[PDB]
Amino acid sequence: PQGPEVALTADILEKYFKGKTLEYIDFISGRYSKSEPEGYDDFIANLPLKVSNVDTKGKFLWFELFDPNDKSNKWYIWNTFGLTGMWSLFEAKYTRAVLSFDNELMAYFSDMRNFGTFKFSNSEKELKRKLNELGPDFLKNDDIDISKIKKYKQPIVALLMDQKKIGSGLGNYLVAEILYRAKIDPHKLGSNLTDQEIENLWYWIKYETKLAYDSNHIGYMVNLENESSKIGRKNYHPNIHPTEKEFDFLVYRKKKDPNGNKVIADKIIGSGKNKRTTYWAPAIQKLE
């Protein structure tokens, strides 16, 4: 899941668990049932703890907890989703982690491919340094300066997929959709973009991330599509107003764009076993 999906997940987790007391956390299958997460023993020794917040930056999510009788003792749960990670209020297929709160209340993290990660820390300083490794959140930061793009002689698609250089939160499908809307050839070097293209790009980044965030069932958040329709949406990018009422793929994994133009499944980024497919329509997206 990308930035918008992680942010919405955090919103739902806060709605149901902020203020609740976590009593236990179990890794019933997957990587962590085979080898425990960093800081796990330390953490379980300090439970029960109360959840004060569930926040996100880009595709990174974390829980902040503390003991009511020692507000100073703050603990954190670091979580990344990988390609198939998801949270749910019910024990879905592929459930890896089970969090037990007071009063029989439960939260579950499922992950088919086990690429998601968990880390437990008692250091606010370590979390801060972690957050500083990520660029500003494309969905939550309404005043990002993307003109920094002009300093890089690299394909714009690669710059937007990077989680530090310009901003954080964009993944394979969002970048493809954004570039199509902005009418920019994915191969174009950031150092060759005009100020007008940059202004345009910023607009569509805000448009697409907000649309994705406001959606209820784009696809990979099925275990919560029920909750997505029962919770509101924070007013990120307040001045941008998408017309569609649900996110839809214009080019990602499509043979043709909405108007019949051929879509190329291009291999631009990566090498070896990490190559990604970049979907774009040349009749629309130009280098100039």
Partner DNA sequence: GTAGACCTGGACG
Partner DNA sequence: CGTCCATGTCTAC
CB of 91 to DNA, least distance (A): 16
Number of Cβ within a 10 Å radius of residue 5: 26
- Among 2, 79, 95, 216, which residue interacts with DNA (rule: CB under 7 A)? 2
User: Which of residues 75 and 279 has its CB atom nearest to DNA in the complex?
Assistant: 279
Residue 162 CA to residue 145 CA, distance in Å, equals: 15
DSSP codes of every residue in 18-84? TTPEEEEEEE-SSHHHHSPPBTHHHHHTT-SEEEEEEEEETTEEEEEEEETTEEEEEEEEEEE-TTT
- Among 31, 130, 150, 187, which residue interacts with DNA (rule: CB under 7 A)? 31
CB of 132 to DNA, least distance (A): 13
Helix spans in 150-194 (H)? 156-161, 172-181
User: Which of residues 65 and 160 has its CB atom nearest to DNA in the complex?
Assistant: 160
User: Which of residues 90 and 115 has its CB atom nearest to DNA in the complex?
Assistant: 115
Asked whether the beta carbons of 279 and 252 are under 8 A apart, the reply is yes
CB of 2 to DNA, least distance (A): 5
Residues 218-257 that bind DNA (CB under 7 A): 218-220, 253
Residue 44 CA to residue 21 CA, distance in Å, equals: 13
Residues 46-105 that bind DNA (CB under 7 A): 58-60, 80-83
CB of 231 to DNA, least distance (A): 18
CB of 13 to DNA, least distance (A): 17
Strand partners, 120: 77
**Contacts with DNA: how many residues (CB under 7 A)?**
32
Asked whether the beta carbons of 55 and 18 are under 8 A apart, the reply is no
Q: Identify the CA nearest to 214 among candidates 199, 195, 236.
A: 236
Residues 6+ apart with CB under 8 A from 58: 3, 6, 134, 135, 137, 138, 163, 167, 168, 169
Is 282 one of the binding residues for DNA (CB under 7 A)?
A: no
CB of 238 to DNA, least distance (A): 24
CB of 84 to DNA, least distance (A): 7
The helix/strand/coil state of 130 is: helix
Q: In the 8-state DSSP scheme, what is residue 260?
A: S
At how many degrees (to 10) do helices 195-214 and 3-17 cross? Answer: 40
Residues 152-191 that bind DNA (CB under 7 A): 163, 171-173
- Among 258, 270, 286, 287, which residue interacts with DNA (rule: CB under 7 A)? 270
Is 129 one of the binding residues for DNA (CB under 7 A)?
A: no
User: Which of residues 65 and 156 has its CB atom nearest to DNA in the complex?
Assistant: 156
Q: Which of these segments, 45-53, 182-190, 238-246, 274-282, binds DNA (CB under 7 A)?
A: 274-282
Instruction: Give the footprint of DNA on this chain (CB under 7 A).
Output: 1-2, 5, 30-31, 58-60, 80-83, 112-115, 163, 171-173, 218-220, 253, 265, 270-274, 276-277
